[PDB]
Scaffold this motif. Structure first.
Motif, PDB file in Angstrom:
ATOM      1  N   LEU A  89       0.817  -1.221   0.000  1.00 20.57           N
ATOM      2  CA  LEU A  89       0.000   0.000   0.000  1.00 20.57           C
ATOM      3  C   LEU A  89       0.856   1.280   0.000  1.00 20.57           C
ATOM      4  CD1 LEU A  89      -2.818  -1.228   2.378  1.00 20.57           C
ATOM      5  CD2 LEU A  89      -3.280  -0.070   0.186  1.00 20.57           C
ATOM      6  N   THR A  93       0.915   4.289  -3.070  1.00 20.49           N
ATOM      7  CA  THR A  93       0.331   5.584  -2.717  1.00 20.49           C
ATOM      8  C   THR A  93       1.415   6.663  -2.545  1.00 20.49           C
ATOM      9  OG1 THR A  93       0.113   4.947  -0.320  1.00 20.49           O
ATOM     10  CG2 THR A  93      -1.787   4.551  -1.767  1.00 20.49           C
ATOM     11  N   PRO A 137     -12.854  -3.969  -1.748  1.00 18.03           N
ATOM     12  CA  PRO A 137     -11.909  -3.031  -1.124  1.00 18.03           C
ATOM     13  C   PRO A 137     -11.225  -3.537   0.164  1.00 18.03           C
ATOM     14  CG  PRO A 137     -14.158  -2.373  -0.630  1.00 18.03           C
ATOM     15  CD  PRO A 137     -14.257  -3.551  -1.558  1.00 18.03           C
ATOM     16  N   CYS A 143      -4.812  -4.680  -0.980  1.00 19.25           N
ATOM     17  CA  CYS A 143      -3.587  -3.882  -0.810  1.00 19.25           C
ATOM     18  C   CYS A 143      -2.968  -3.495  -2.171  1.00 19.25           C
ATOM     19  CB  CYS A 143      -2.585  -4.604   0.120  1.00 19.25           C
ATOM     20  SG  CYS A 143      -2.100  -6.290  -0.372  1.00 19.25           S
ATOM     21  N   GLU A 146      -6.567  -1.890  -4.813  1.00 19.81           N
ATOM     22  CA  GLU A 146      -6.941  -0.522  -4.420  1.00 19.81           C
ATOM     23  C   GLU A 146      -5.771   0.455  -4.492  1.00 19.81           C
ATOM     24  OE1 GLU A 146      -9.650   1.016  -3.973  1.00 19.81           O
ATOM     25  OE2 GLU A 146     -10.754  -0.833  -4.280  1.00 19.81           O
ATOM     26  N   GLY A 147      -4.568  -0.019  -4.175  1.00 24.81           N
ATOM     27  CA  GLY A 147      -3.367   0.809  -4.363  1.00 24.81           C
ATOM     28  C   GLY A 147      -3.194   1.278  -5.806  1.00 24.81           C
ATOM     29  N   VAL A 150      -6.135   3.879  -6.921  1.00 29.97           N
ATOM     30  CA  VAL A 150      -5.887   5.240  -6.418  1.00 29.97           C
ATOM     31  C   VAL A 150      -4.645   5.908  -7.051  1.00 29.97           C
ATOM     32  CG1 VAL A 150      -4.596   4.824  -4.247  1.00 29.97           C
ATOM     33  CG2 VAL A 150      -6.231   6.707  -4.382  1.00 29.97           C
TER      34      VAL A 150
ATOM     35  N   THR B  93      -5.228   9.487   2.242  1.00 33.27           N
ATOM     36  CA  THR B  93      -4.173   8.475   2.156  1.00 33.27           C
ATOM     37  C   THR B  93      -3.083   8.704   3.218  1.00 33.27           C
ATOM     38  OG1 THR B  93      -3.055   9.654   0.270  1.00 33.27           O
ATOM     39  CG2 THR B  93      -4.669   7.934  -0.277  1.00 33.27           C
ATOM     40  N   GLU B 146     -12.221   6.953  -4.228  1.00 35.16           N
ATOM     41  CA  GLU B 146     -11.049   6.065  -4.168  1.00 35.16           C
ATOM     42  C   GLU B 146     -10.180   6.316  -2.939  1.00 35.16           C
ATOM     43  OE1 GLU B 146     -10.157   3.434  -5.645  1.00 35.16           O
ATOM     44  OE2 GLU B 146     -11.892   3.574  -6.950  1.00 35.16           O
ATOM     45  N   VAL B 150      -9.437   3.119  -0.295  1.00 36.04           N
ATOM     46  CA  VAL B 150      -8.079   2.725   0.113  1.00 36.04           C
ATOM     47  C   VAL B 150      -7.795   2.976   1.612  1.00 36.04           C
ATOM     48  CG1 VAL B 150      -6.671   4.765  -0.527  1.00 36.04           C
ATOM     49  CG2 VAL B 150      -5.724   2.469  -0.782  1.00 36.04           C
ATOM     50  N   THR B 153      -8.838  -0.203   3.234  1.00 41.30           N
ATOM     51  CA  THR B 153      -7.818  -1.218   2.967  1.00 41.30           C
ATOM     52  C   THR B 153      -6.649  -1.080   3.964  1.00 41.30           C
ATOM     53  OG1 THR B 153      -8.334  -0.904   0.577  1.00 41.30           O
ATOM     54  CG2 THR B 153      -6.498  -2.356   1.146  1.00 41.30           C
TER      55      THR B 153
END
Ligand SMILES: NC(=O)c1ccc[n+]([C@@H]2O[C@H](COP(=O)([O-])OP(=O)(O)OC[C@H]3O[C@@H](n4cnc5c(N)ncnc54)[C@H](O)[C@@H]3O)[C@@H](O)[C@H]2O)c1
Ligand SMILES: NC(=O)c1ccc[n+]([C@@H]2O[C@H](COP(=O)([O-])OP(=O)(O)OC[C@H]3O[C@@H](n4cnc5c(N)ncnc54)[C@H](O)[C@@H]3O)[C@@H](O)[C@H]2O)c1
Ligand SMILES: O=c1ccn([C@@H]2O[C@H](COP(=O)(O)OP(=O)(O)O)[C@@H](O)[C@H]2O)c(=O)[nH]1
Ligand SMILES: O=c1ccn([C@@H]2O[C@H](COP(=O)(O)OP(=O)(O)O)[C@@H](O)[C@H]2O)c(=O)[nH]1
Ligand SMILES: O=c1ccn([C@@H]2O[C@H](COP(=O)(O)OP(=O)(O)O)[C@@H](O)[C@H]2O)c(=O)[nH]1
Ligand SMILES: O=c1ccn([C@@H]2O[C@H](COP(=O)(O)OP(=O)(O)O)[C@@H](O)[C@H]2O)c(=O)[nH]1
Lengths: 312, 312
Positions: A89, A93, A137, A143, A146-147, A150, B93, B146, B150, B153
């Motif tokens: 993650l 991000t 999700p 991990c 969704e990573g 985004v 995030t 989004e 996340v 998550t």
């Protein structure tokens, strides 16, 4: 000629992209932390006047001057991205935010290596770029899934608000030389099991489907997309779809193996089908894959036969 | 008695949660950057021995000692979360990562204020916690949708890998006193238009649906969830669903207004329906909403009539 950064450049796909751009005469910098990649994948360029390798984790800030950024840094194999979900993650991000910050400051064009996993367990077929996806999700694969979703959102936010030039590739299952023996993805597992006479381990019934592309086709697509004027997402994949049991049978045949095929537990939240629509890449880039499946698999089998020798 | 942190505690929901926990005798710290909230919402507690207000952006690291964290920091209104998409994404995030890091270090239990938007434009009805959602990852609302997906998550990654105690609330449309006049959400817009005799501005045909909950019901649900042993997501909302045109007609009636109802352009990617399934909250927490819609709307109308006086 251009100054180019490749994050994740010591991995499987990144090392083949490095080769193409160095051959074309550009100045290439590779950034990698060797979580799943290795120095051996790019060692042939170490010492060349136009090449540099930097040991660096993309979650930490990076200040260099370049014209283009190919952003490939992330674990990619389900066993390796589920090993440590927090690491996965953070990479997708914080890592993507740092690379967009760099592009903004120096005026570079950035390409994101996104994934067919943004489509999840699909409810339309084939999958075109207008489909929004069906993704859990909070499941064990989230991990990564969704990573990556985004990370796409972040690219379009920087384009709209800060004028950053962005390109987004949605990459479908790709295989070839330089994959790690313990990577854990299906093409490497089946080839190595078959070569050693061990059971081919099918997860579930084997009725689930995938569509596989050879690495040189992906690399040509990535360079075409980077140098185009198309900023919206583009699928890069081979449209030839088969079941996982069919793939096991084909690998067993191409290797010439007496391995048993065994049926183990299903993978949790495993997508049940996958087939890219590549009309957009064809019409806007003039690109399509040109390497047939059997030709590609034979190149990969040669690589792994050599590797098992580099062990024994 | 407990030491409790509330991020976003100077906003609409956070200020009502602050009131409940201070009345119950706990030591409460509020963290806020005043992007969409304001000091006026919590000014009545400033000076109390058990209260502190800190001007702080959650994207910056925070080191304090607490037993519980209610994590509510994010813009919430579509015009305000789409104002600056980069700010929205960073808050959801980086902000969530920093608060999970804090919980890990000090041994605190963390609750996340998630959203019905994780379900997107739904293809099942009503929406229960087992539904994965239908969400555009690159549309104009994705910076929020989004970002929140996340954040969920991330909570489950820290629970599994690091043993952090987590709770996740999926919050459905909530209204009440203390909302800003220029917030831009539908309940505040319609009440203020009706009070001033200006046209009620329906976006699209008004056939799209929502289900609205009064703020005191949400606050009781958040405290019940925090102090339960349930770590998987729980929907907190009122199951009473109506169309946006029906809501405009009801507000016009309750205010006693001669305002025209006008039909403007649709909002891009606007969810077309929404209705929570709250069986899980009922069976596991013993919780349900107890404030009827008309009673709640009358409390909100009183607040805004006073506000227009605080202007004139
Ligand atoms: N090959 C595929 O079928 C496929 C499919 C979809 C998406 N992709 C994407 O393409 C990219 C390359 O995939 P691959 O198949 O070459 O896998 P890979 O694991 O070989 O390559 C990933 C590289 O990124 C590096 N890395 C990981 N985290 C990092 C970090 N925090 N900082 C710096 N480096 C880091 C690894 O060490 C590795 O060298 C990935 O982003 C992957 O998600 C690949
Ligand atoms: N009210 C609802 O119908 C609803 C629905 C779904 C989810 N939620 C969630 O509940 C929470 C509260 O919503 P609300 O309706 O009270 O909205 P709000 O805008 O009044 O409250 C959000 C608060 O967070 C603060 N904030 C924003 N970014 C911050 C940052 N980076 N650092 C510190 N503080 C920051 C704002 O200044 C504000 O006080 C939000 O997370 C929202 O997404 C609310
Ligand atoms: O050359 C750069 C410029 C920025 N950053 C990182 O990128 C992030 C995002 O950049 P942005 O311009 O959005 O942030 P800002 O400067 O406003 O904090 C920053 O926090 C930096 O840590 C980086 O790694 N290299
Ligand atoms: O030893 C293996 C490895 C994978 N798979 C299956 O092959 C498919 C592709 O898996 P891979 O990890 O290569 O890629 P992804 O799931 O990311 O598409 C999935 O259905 C897996 O469950 C399998 O049957 N046996
Ligand atoms: O009391 C704390 C502890 C950590 N952090 C932040 O939370 C992040 C995530 O914490 P984690 O424990 O995962 O990271 P690590 O310590 O391994 O870097 C860190 O980078 C810190 O900036 C914080 O804001 N308050
Ligand atoms: O002046 C307004 C404000 C909003 N809406 C609509 O009312 C619904 C709820 O909007 P809101 O911003 O309150 O919440 P959300 O879309 O986040 O559920 C949506 O269909 C909006 O397009 C409307 O018709 N007029």
């Amino acid at each position: 000629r251009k100054r180019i950064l490749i994050t994740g450049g010591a991995g499987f796909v990144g090392s083949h992209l490095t080769d193409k751009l160095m051959m074309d005469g550009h100045e290439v910098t590779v950034v990698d932390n060797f979580f799943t990649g290795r120095k051996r994948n790019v060692e042939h360029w170490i010492g060349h006047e136009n090449f540099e390798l930097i040991n660096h984790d993309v979650v930490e800030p990076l200040y260099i001057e370049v014209d283009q950024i190919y952003h490939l840094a992330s674990p990619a194999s389900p066993p390796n991205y589920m090993y440590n979900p927090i690491k996965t993650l953070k990479t997708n991000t914080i890592g993507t935010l740092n690379m967009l910050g760099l592009a903004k400051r120096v005026g570079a064009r950035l390409l994101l290596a996104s994934t067919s996993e943004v489509y999840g367990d699909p409810e339309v077929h084939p999958q075109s770029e207008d489909y929004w996806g069906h993704v859990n999700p909070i499941g064990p694969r989230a991990c990564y899934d969704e990573g990556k979703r985004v990370a796409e959102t972040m690219c379009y936010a920087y384009m709209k608000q800060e004028g950053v030039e962005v390109r987004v590739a949605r990459i479908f299952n790709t295989f070839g030389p330089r994959m790690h023996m313990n990577d854990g993805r299906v093409v490497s597992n089946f080839i190595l099991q078959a070569l050693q006479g061990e059971p081919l381990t099918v997860y579930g019934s084997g009725s689930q489907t995938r569509a596989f592309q050879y690495v040189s086709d992906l690399v040509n697509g990535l360079v075409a997309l980077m140098n185009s004027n198309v900023s919206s997402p583009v699928n890069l994949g081979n449209p030839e779809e088969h079941t996982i049991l069919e793939f096991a049978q084909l690998i067993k045949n191409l290797v010439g193996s007496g391995s048993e095929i065994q049926f183990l537990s299903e993978a949790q939240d495993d997508p049940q089908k996958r087939k890219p629509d590549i009309k957009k890449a064809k019409l806007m880039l003039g690109w399509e894959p040109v390497v047939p499946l059997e030709e590609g698999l034979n190149k990969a089998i040669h690589y792994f036969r050599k590797e098992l020798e580099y062990q024994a």
